[PDB]
């Protein structure tokens, strides 16, 4: 799962035609560490979807633009557009998001 390390990297990735799913997380987050391995398992299951993560405490400019309301939030992108947002760390919700994104890809 790619740790996104700059605003420019983030903009390049989310602007792509290939579908990307980003896990917005932080050290202040409760369940982020517990759900992260499941996200990594999904990355193995769905090799034609791009998986990425953003540490909002380290990436202020990304965080300001993403403007998340829940910690964590998973956001899917395609062609510079947010195509779906999933809040929280519920495995089934994240699995359902990937099913639908992977079909799109």
From TrEMBL:
GO molecular function: protein-disulfide reductase activity
Disulfide bridge map: 29-32, 29-32
Sites annotated Deprotonates C-terminal active site Cys: 23
Site residues (Contributes to redox potential value), renumbered to this chain: 30-31
Keyword field: Disulfide bond, Redox-active center
One of the Pfam families matching this protein, by short name: Thioredoxin
Residue span(s) of domain Thioredoxin: 1-103
Active site per the UniProt annotation: 29 (nucleophile), 32 (nucleophile)
Keyword Membrane: no
Sequence similarity: Belongs to the thioredoxin family.
Protein's recorded name: Thioredoxin
């Amino acid at each position: 799962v790619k740790a996104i390390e700059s605003y420019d990297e983030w903009k390049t990735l989310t602007s792509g035609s290939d579908v990307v799913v980003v896990d917005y997380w932080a050290t202040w987050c409760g369940p982020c560490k517990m759900i992260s391995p499941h996200f990594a398992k999904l990355e193995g299951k769905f090799p034609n979807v791009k998986f990425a993560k953003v540490d909002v405490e380290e990436q202020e400019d990304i965080a300001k633009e993403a403007q998340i309301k829940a910690m964590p939030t998973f956001v899917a992108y395609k062609d510079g557009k947010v195509i779906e947002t999933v809040t929280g760390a519920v495995p089934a919700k994240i699995n359902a998001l990937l099913d639908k994104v992977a079909a799109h890809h």
